[PDB]
Design a protein around this ligand. Structure first.
Ligand SMILES: OC[C@H]1O[C@@H](O[C@H]2[C@H](O)[C@@H](O)[C@H](O[C@H]3[C@H](O)[C@@H](O)[C@H](O[C@H]4[C@H](O)[C@@H](O)[C@H](O)O[C@@H]4CO)O[C@@H]3CO)O[C@@H]2CO)[C@H](O)[C@@H](O)[C@@H]1O
Ligand SMILES: [Ca+2]
Ligand SMILES: [Ca+2]
Length: 270
């Protein structure tokens, strides 16, 4: 009834599928994803109640030493839908068929209910991201002619990679009320093209719905990549990146109670 993964007990790379009907196709996949920590004292644990659907993350890390300080952040504990292109983990039991080419995909709303509790000023975000790859089912990383798109709906103490490009309006729903929100658009070249959308009014807790194609359309429009609409939207990842190279302790708790992808009857890109 409860799935639990724990670092370092389960190794340096704990993760697991959420497969509530036991049908061998996960609905979501969870990873502690401390991808830039070489060593730390303490623990991180992610637990998922299969009946309530609550995902609860508890992290108490100290003495943190990074694998490569140029990566900046320490990790990105997360839950995702689709095929994460950095490894062989996937989740495809859901209404949106990911991966799909961006030219063939419907737009969709993403709704998340959550609450974040970083401790003592830990730098952090709550970031949704997708990878856009040239092949349909990538599992071995990302090339220079591909894109990473992130959407930050909370942040404290972190800035996206690269340079600020512009600000856009995106109509979103926050705590049941439709609102016009502003996102800063950032672009970088970090081994691949990176585009990030950082909300100007961070939301630390509640229920937020965003229209995914508002973001992908802007990422396509500002892209320097050729043949953008032939890329595959591999996945939708939701997690909290945390830490900086001068962060040595990172205590954080959060909860996610619902994630829903709702198809729209319109193209993803407009
Ligand atoms: O060899 C040990 C172990 O490796 C596992 O594979 C690791 C790769 O080694 C590691 O490079 C990869 O890290 C990814 C990570 O999964 C992504 O979440 C992260 O995304 C970053 C993004 O790169 C940034 O630009 C943006 O700002 O932040 C996001 C979120 O922080 O990117 C890094 C790549 O740099 O993770 C793999 C595991 O998922 C093997 O799978 C295992 O078998 C080996 O034992
Ligand atoms: Ca399933
Ligand atoms: Ca994968």
């Amino acid at each position: 009834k409860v799935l639990k993964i724990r670092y370092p007990d389960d190794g340096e790379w704990p993760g697991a599928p959420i497969d509530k009907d036991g049908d061998g196709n996960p609905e979501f996949y969870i990873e502690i994803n401390l991808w830039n920590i070489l060593n730390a004292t303490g623990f991180a644990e992610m637990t998922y109640n299969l009946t309530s659907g609550v995902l609860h993350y508890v992290q108490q890390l100290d003495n943190i030493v990074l694998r490569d300080r140029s990566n900046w952040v320490h990790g990105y504990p997360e839950i995702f839908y689709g095929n994460k292109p950095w490894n062989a983990n996937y989740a495809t039991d859901g209404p949106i068929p990911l991966p799909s080419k961006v030219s063939n995909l419907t737009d969709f709303y993403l709704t998340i209910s959550y609450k974040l509790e970083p401790k003592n000023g830990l730098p952090i975000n709550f970031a949704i991201e997708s990878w856009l790859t040239r092949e349909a089912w990538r599992t071995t990383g990302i090339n220079s002619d591909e894109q990473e798109v992130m959407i930050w709906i909370y942040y404290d103490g972190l800035q996206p990679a690269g340079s600020k490009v512009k600000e856009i309006v995106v109509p979103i729903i926050v705590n049941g009320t439709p609102v016009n929100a502003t996102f800063e658009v950032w672009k970088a070249n970090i081994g691949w093209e990176y585009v990030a959308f950082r909300i100007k009014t961070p939301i630390k807790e509640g229920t937020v719905t965003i229209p995914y194609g508002a973001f992908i359309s802007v990422a396509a429009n500002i892209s320097s990549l050729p043949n953008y609409t032939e890329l595959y939207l591999e996945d939708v990842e939701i997690g909290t990146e945390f830490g900086t190279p001068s962060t040595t302790s990172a205590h954080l708790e959060w909860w996610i109670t619902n994630i829903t992808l709702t198809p729209l009857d319109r193209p993803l890109i407009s």
